[PDB]
Amino acid sequence: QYQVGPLLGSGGFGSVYSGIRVSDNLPVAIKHVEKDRISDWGELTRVPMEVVLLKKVSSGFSGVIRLLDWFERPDSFVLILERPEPVQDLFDFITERGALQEELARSFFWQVLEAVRHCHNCGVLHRDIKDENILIDLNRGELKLIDFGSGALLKDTVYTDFDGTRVYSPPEWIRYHRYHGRSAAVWSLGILLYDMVCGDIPFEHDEEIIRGQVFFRQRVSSECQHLIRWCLALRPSDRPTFEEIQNHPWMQDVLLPQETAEIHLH
Ligand SMILES: NCCCNc1nc(-c2ccccc2O)nc2ccccc12
Ligand SMILES: [Ca+2]
Ligand SMILES: [Cl-]
Ligand SMILES: [Cl-]
């Protein structure tokens, strides 16, 4: 069914290969994870939570990489995922080009917010929003979220477990091992937005997270700084809702994805 190409990446999520579907030559990504390396399991019949979450968000179109198929092997699960070409993750894009111009960051950040709101509307909490989990479709200027392997069903009660990226995790997690879904998502989005406009993350150590004082090392507009510090409020209830982020003055007059690729990516 699939012709396997080069390894695209490996890590906590397993090993992802480029691939082609033999029937129609569709580009795909093929991701393998060992059963013993999976901790979180759910039901559709017993599968990794990742599969449950991906099925919940893979309906229709969105800024989420769609699950096409999956296989169970004796000791592993294989996922067949959509693959845009050419593509680059946002971590590589930022490493390569440095801090993003605000117009470009606005466009990218907006698409991330739309993608995250889609997950939430589908009852899915990502829990690992970061540059490495965002793919850029370089020709269409469209961003796509990947790696639901630390995710959970969205709920309104407290989470007491976390296995995403610590430097994107909120202070209430660091201090108390307790967070709520959406306000922890908004914290990670503040980290992400800082990362886009400054070219690196604002905090490296637990004590920096807990203090929550943001220093801007690059020239960033007042409205962008304001949105960032809002998302990064120490008290979860002081953070903006998704609607408040998208109504923020910094977020107005966003470029279309194709405009974005034409101005910034070609
Ligand atoms: N940090 C990026 C990892 C390597 N690249 C890629 N990684 C993943 C991927 C990585 C971890 C978990 C789920 C996933 O779908 N999916 C991709 C889908 C299409 C193209 C590339 C992909
Ligand atoms: Ca500045
Ligand atoms: Cl693995
Ligand atoms: Cl942690």
Swiss-Prot record:
UniProtKB keywords: Apoptosis, ATP-binding, Cell cycle, Cell membrane, Cytoplasm, Host-virus interaction, Kinase, Magnesium, Membrane, Metal-binding, Nucleotide-binding, Nucleus, Phosphoprotein, Proto-oncogene, Serine/threonine-protein kinase, Transferase, Ubl conjugation
Give GO terms: molecular function aspect only: ATP binding; manganese ion binding; protein serine kinase activity; protein serine/threonine kinase activator activity; protein serine/threonine kinase activity; ribosomal small subunit binding; transcription factor binding
Q: In which tissues is it expressed?
A: Expressed primarily in cells of the hematopoietic and germline lineages. Isoform 1 and isoform 2 are both expressed in prostate cancer cell lines.
- Enzyme Commission code: 2.7.11.1
* SMART domains cross-referenced by the UniProt entry: S_TKc
| Entry's Gene Ontology cellular component terms | cytoplasm; cytosol; nucleolus; nucleoplasm; nucleus; plasma membrane
- Cofactor requirement: Mg(2+)
* Domain named Protein kinase: residues: 2-251
Sites bearing Phosphoserine, chain numbering: S59, S222
Q: One Pfam family this chain carries?
A: Pkinase
Query: Active site located where?
Result: D128
What's the PTM story here? Autophosphorylated on both serine/threonine and tyrosine residues. Phosphorylated. Interaction with PPP2CA promotes dephosphorylation. Ubiquitinated, leading to proteasomal degradation.
Query: Where do the annotations place ATP binding?
Result: L8, G9, S10, G11, G12, F13, G14, S15, V16, K31, E82, D89
List, in alphabetical order, the GO biological process terms annotated in this UniProt record. Answer: apoptotic process; cellular detoxification; cellular response to type II interferon; negative regulation of apoptotic process; negative regulation of DNA-binding transcription factor activity; negative regulation of innate immune response; positive regulation of brown fat cell differentiation; positive regulation of cardiac muscle cell proliferation
Q: What catalytic reaction does the record list? A: L-seryl-[protein] + ATP = O-phospho-L-seryl-[protein] + ADP + H(+); L-threonyl-[protein] + ATP = O-phospho-L-threonyl-[protein] + ADP + H(+)
What changing H32Y does, per the record, is: Increased kinase activity
List the induction conditions: By interferon-gamma (IFNG). Strongly induced in leukocytes by the JAK/STAT pathway in response to cytokines. Induced by different cellular stresses, heat shock and cytotoxic agents.
Does the record bear Magnesium in its keywords? yes
Top EC class of this enzyme: transferase
What protein family does this chain belong to?
Answer: Belongs to the protein kinase superfamily. CAMK Ser/Thr protein kinase family. PIM subfamily.
Could you describe the subunit structure of this protein? Interacts with RP9. Interacts with HSP90AA1, this interaction stabilizes PIM1 protein levels. Interacts (ubiquitinated form) with HSP70 and promotes its proteasomal degradation. (Microbial infection) Interacts with Epstein-Barr virus EBNA6; this interaction upregulates and stabilizes PIM1 and induces cell proliferation by inhibiting the growth suppressive properties of p21.
What this chain does, per the record?
Proto-oncogene with serine/threonine kinase activity involved in cell survival and cell proliferation and thus providing a selective advantage in tumorigenesis. Exerts its oncogenic activity through: the regulation of MYC transcriptional activity, the regulation of cell cycle progression and by phosphorylation and inhibition of proapoptotic proteins (BAD, MAP3K5, FOXO3). Phosphorylation of MYC leads to an increase of MYC protein stability and thereby an increase of transcriptional activity.
Q: What is the protein name stated in its UniProt record?
A: Serine/threonine-protein kinase pim-1
Organism for this UniProt entry: Homo sapiens (Human)
The organism that produces this protein has a lineage beginning with: Eukaryota, Metazoa, Chordata, Craniata, Vertebrata
